[PDB]
Amino acid sequence: NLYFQSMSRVLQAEELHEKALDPFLLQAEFFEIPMNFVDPKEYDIPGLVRKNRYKTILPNPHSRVCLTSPDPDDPLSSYINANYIRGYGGEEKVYIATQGPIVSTVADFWRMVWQEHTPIIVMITTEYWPEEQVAYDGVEITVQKVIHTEDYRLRLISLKSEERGLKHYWFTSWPDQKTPDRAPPLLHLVREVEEAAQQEGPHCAPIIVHSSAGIGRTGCFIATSICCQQLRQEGVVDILKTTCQLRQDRGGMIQTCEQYQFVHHVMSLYEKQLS
């Protein structure tokens, strides 16, 4: 309850299915949740203008990812528009939510990937990866394989500087209409990424998730991911509490009520699948 009082509504299956189909209640509930955006004046850093895609969408200071190499004491060098995000049950640093890299932040993005030992990137739609190979700040980035599926493209990537693997999931099927029939692809991606995460073994490093601003579709993906574990482990989902937790970590996570309803559609579907 750092910036604001968290709210909760624990949904068992019956209520979950009905809740997903009550837009009047969904909007009432959603617009009670503070956005928790940071005042841009909190950052007074020359050159910061080049680092943000949107001037009013900035990382909450307490959870921002600081880039500690090569100049941790320089505000601009240490800056990236990205926040550590708690996962299911409040587990620290399960994800990093960040804006889609822009021309001026591609190298910064890779600095973060290397710093955090990130095993997986989830991209939801600048092409910041090479066609074959490119090097930033001492780390050689090689795309070893491209795997095309119905709804995403998966790149298997080598990072060498010490060699590490990286899985890059590019989800292209973000629906214009957030209707129940559009839920399955997002659910499938969420479950694929869960499996990939588990395959990394103990003490998994943060999973990077991005979209243009890194709040709306990024928030939907992460909320759904968290709630899937909750459903399997507890037999309930608390989308309201999860959304509150996300907002405490990064202002604006889940931007629209249509997105909020979509998360309910996805969870209702998953409950049916599990049942």
Author numbering: -7 to -1, 258 to 375, 385 to 420, 423 to 536
Paper text:
Protein tyrosine phosphatases (PTPs) play a critical role in regulating cellular functions by selectively dephosphorylating their substrates. The ∼280 residue PTP catalytic domain consists of an α/β structure, and biochemical and structural studies have led to a detailed understanding of the catalytic mechanism (Barford et al., 1994; Zhang, 2002). Here we report the crystal structures of 22 PTP domains, including two tandem-domain RPTP structures and a detailed structural comparison of this protein family.
The observation of an open substrate complex and closed apo structures (Pedersen et al., 2004) raises the question of the mechanism that triggers loop closure. This scenario is present in the R7 group phosphatases (PCPTP, STEP, and HEPTP). In contrast, RPTPσ, the R7 group, and NT4 group PTPs were quite selective and showed a preference for a sequence derived from the phosphorylation site in N-cadherin (pY785), a reported substrate of RPTPσ (Siu et al., 2007). Surprisingly, sedimentation velocity measurements showed that all single-domain RPTPs studied (IA2, IA2β, GLEPP1, DEP1, and STEP) were entirely monomeric in solution, as were tandem-domain receptor PTPs (RPTPα, CD45, RPTPɛ, and RPTPμ).
